[PDB]
Design a protein around this motif. Sequence first.
Motif, mmCIF file in Angstrom:
data_model
loop_
_atom_site.group_PDB
_atom_site.id
_atom_site.type_symbol
_atom_site.label_atom_id
_atom_site.label_comp_id
_atom_site.label_asym_id
_atom_site.label_seq_id
_atom_site.Cartn_x
_atom_site.Cartn_y
_atom_site.Cartn_z
ATOM 1 N N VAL A 185 28.204 32.501 -5.908
ATOM 2 C CA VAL A 185 29.232 31.468 -6.018
ATOM 3 C C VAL A 185 30.293 31.649 -4.936
ATOM 4 N N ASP A 186 30.803 32.870 -4.796
ATOM 5 C CA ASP A 186 31.817 33.159 -3.776
ATOM 6 C C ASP A 186 31.275 33.412 -2.352
ATOM 7 N N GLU A 187 31.043 32.330 -1.611
ATOM 8 C CA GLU A 187 30.484 32.390 -0.262
ATOM 9 C C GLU A 187 31.266 33.242 0.766
ATOM 10 N N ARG A 188 32.569 33.420 0.559
ATOM 11 C CA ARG A 188 33.392 34.150 1.523
ATOM 12 C C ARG A 188 33.438 35.631 1.242
ATOM 13 N N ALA A 189 33.265 35.989 -0.025
ATOM 14 C CA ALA A 189 33.001 37.373 -0.348
ATOM 15 C C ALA A 189 31.599 37.719 0.189
ATOM 16 N N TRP A 190 30.672 36.745 0.150
ATOM 17 C CA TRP A 190 29.295 36.946 0.626
ATOM 18 C C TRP A 190 29.301 37.273 2.110
ATOM 19 N N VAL A 192 28.411 41.077 3.824
ATOM 20 C CA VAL A 192 27.282 41.082 4.768
ATOM 21 C C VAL A 192 27.714 41.652 6.130
ATOM 22 N N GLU A 193 28.756 41.067 6.717
ATOM 23 C CA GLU A 193 29.264 41.501 8.023
ATOM 24 C C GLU A 193 29.705 42.956 8.012
ATOM 25 N N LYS A 194 30.277 43.378 6.887
ATOM 26 C CA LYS A 194 30.825 44.746 6.717
ATOM 27 C C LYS A 194 29.779 45.843 6.429
ATOM 28 N N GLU A 195 28.637 45.453 5.850
ATOM 29 C CA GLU A 195 27.583 46.394 5.400
ATOM 30 C C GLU A 195 26.143 45.848 5.415
ATOM 31 N N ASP A 196 25.945 44.663 4.825
ATOM 32 C CA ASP A 196 24.623 44.126 4.412
ATOM 33 C C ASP A 196 23.894 45.132 3.515
ATOM 34 N N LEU A 205 -3.816 41.802 -13.858
ATOM 35 C CA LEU A 205 -2.407 42.093 -14.139
ATOM 36 C C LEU A 205 -1.818 42.931 -13.010
ATOM 37 N N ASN A 206 -0.585 42.605 -12.618
ATOM 38 C CA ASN A 206 0.170 43.407 -11.674
ATOM 39 C C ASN A 206 1.305 44.085 -12.408
ATOM 40 N N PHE A 207 1.756 45.201 -11.861
ATOM 41 C CA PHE A 207 3.014 45.791 -12.314
ATOM 42 C C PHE A 207 3.882 46.140 -11.135
ATOM 43 N N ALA A 208 5.183 46.108 -11.367
ATOM 44 C CA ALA A 208 6.127 46.383 -10.306
ATOM 45 C C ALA A 208 7.372 46.906 -10.937
ATOM 46 N N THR A 209 7.989 47.876 -10.262
ATOM 47 C CA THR A 209 9.349 48.280 -10.580
ATOM 48 C C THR A 209 10.376 47.637 -9.633
ATOM 49 N N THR A 210 11.553 47.373 -10.177
ATOM 50 C CA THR A 210 12.699 46.991 -9.381
ATOM 51 C C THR A 210 13.793 48.022 -9.610
ATOM 52 N N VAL A 211 14.426 48.475 -8.530
ATOM 53 C CA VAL A 211 15.689 49.211 -8.616
ATOM 54 C C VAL A 211 16.812 48.254 -8.152
ATOM 55 N N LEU A 212 17.667 47.818 -9.056
ATOM 56 C CA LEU A 212 18.691 46.835 -8.690
ATOM 57 C C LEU A 212 20.010 47.598 -8.620
ATOM 58 N N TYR A 213 20.558 47.691 -7.408
ATOM 59 C CA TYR A 213 21.748 48.532 -7.138
ATOM 60 C C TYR A 213 23.041 47.920 -7.738
ATOM 61 N N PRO A 214 24.041 48.781 -8.027
ATOM 62 C CA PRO A 214 25.294 48.250 -8.547
ATOM 63 C C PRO A 214 26.125 47.608 -7.435
ATOM 64 N N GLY A 215 26.967 46.662 -7.824
ATOM 65 C CA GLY A 215 27.753 45.897 -6.878
ATOM 66 C C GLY A 215 28.264 44.599 -7.464
ATOM 67 N N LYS A 216 29.165 43.983 -6.704
ATOM 68 C CA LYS A 216 29.747 42.680 -6.996
ATOM 69 C C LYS A 216 29.966 41.979 -5.646
ATOM 70 N N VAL A 217 29.592 40.706 -5.606
ATOM 71 C CA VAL A 217 29.990 39.752 -4.586
ATOM 72 C C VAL A 217 31.114 38.962 -5.257
#
Lengths: 189, 189
Positions: B35-40, B44-48, B66-78
């Motif tokens: 939602v917040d495009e300017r935080a986005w 991105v510019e500061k780290e990505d 059948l497939n299986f997959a793990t996701t590791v979803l890192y902590p953060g806020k935009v």
Amino acid sequence: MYKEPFGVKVDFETGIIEGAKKSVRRLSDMEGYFVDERAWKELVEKEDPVVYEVYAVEQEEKEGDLNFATTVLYPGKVGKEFFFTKGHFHAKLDRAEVYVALKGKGGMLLQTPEGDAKWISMEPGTVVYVPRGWAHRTVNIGDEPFIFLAIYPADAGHDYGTIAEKGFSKIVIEENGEVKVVDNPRWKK
Amino acid sequence: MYKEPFGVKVDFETGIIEGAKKSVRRLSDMEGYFVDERAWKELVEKEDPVVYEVYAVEQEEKEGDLNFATTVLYPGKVGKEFFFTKGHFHAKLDRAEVYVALKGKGGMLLQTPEGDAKWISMEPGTVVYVPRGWAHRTVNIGDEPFIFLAIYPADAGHDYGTIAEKGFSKIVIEENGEVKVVDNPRWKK
Ligand SMILES: O=C(O)[C@@H](O)[C@H](O)[C@H](O)COP(=O)(O)O
Ligand SMILES: O=C(O)[C@@H](O)[C@H](O)[C@H](O)COP(=O)(O)O
Ligand SMILES: [Mn+2]
Ligand SMILES: [Mn+2]
């Protein structure tokens, strides 16, 4: 038309799925499955212990849908032969399955209609891929409960009769304190 | 004839599947999602930073597999909005999915094509059932990675297009120290 999504808590330490349907298989429910008939009769009349429990969350039997179930396979032997699940092919032979090992020590014995066998060792973190066409049985080779989670197509079904008729080609026994997979002396061919 | 059965080890602490195909989504890869495009822009510019990583064990696109997959979803806020996965419908709409939460604190957002929405909180041990026809996104609402395992039909495929333009009907935010699921400002038909 759209069905309700849901989450349920699973206790990895106990295998119990809150609010799921529960099934119990006792040794008396497994007549003709173990080689040593006398040690079987002996244990049944002395104790009739629980071999394994299943907590299952199952959907209407339709293509594309998925079921899941935990199994708690308790530790024990019938003579030299480790406790195991009855085992089955699926009613539909073009259906695969995934197991996720959670606690304890075990493995899965697998076989095609012809008789070609496979053993895959299972410890916590093991994910096992059960390919289309293989009957499958799990075995507890340790002294604590062997606990896993199974995810499988809602329309797979269960063919037990063929395993109750012929058994598996291989058996998993303890011998000199060493775990072995060897021929089933009762096997068809 | 007959595929080999196999086991692979999945580390429930790290989400790492030895030898599986590793995919990386970085924040630049998610333009138009938050939602917040300017935080986005700024983050991105500061780290990505990496939003999430995927370890997938996949079969050819055949029905019944059948497939299986793990996701590791890192902590953060935009901005106020917590880190999430892009989200998708399955390309074969009538294909279910099952998720198993392994580590961290999080949840799933779900949406029908017409736009029915549901939030399902996820913690270690939670298993989420994703019905056929529902788009699905996972969100990390805590300070450590949110790690989960998913099992899905080999022929489910992905529809990302729909989600990228329409978005989800709700958003998951931190406000005054409180996790809230609220209406999405960028949402129409
Ligand atoms: O779906 C499976 O293959 C498992 O959940 C088994 O049903 C479970 O482990 C119990 O074994 P069986 O069905 O062989 O009695
Ligand atoms: O198969 C799934 O639904 C998951 O493995 C997701 O693909 C994974 O969590 C990554 O999210 P996405 O595919 O929405 O980028
Ligand atoms: Mn099965
Ligand atoms: Mn999916």
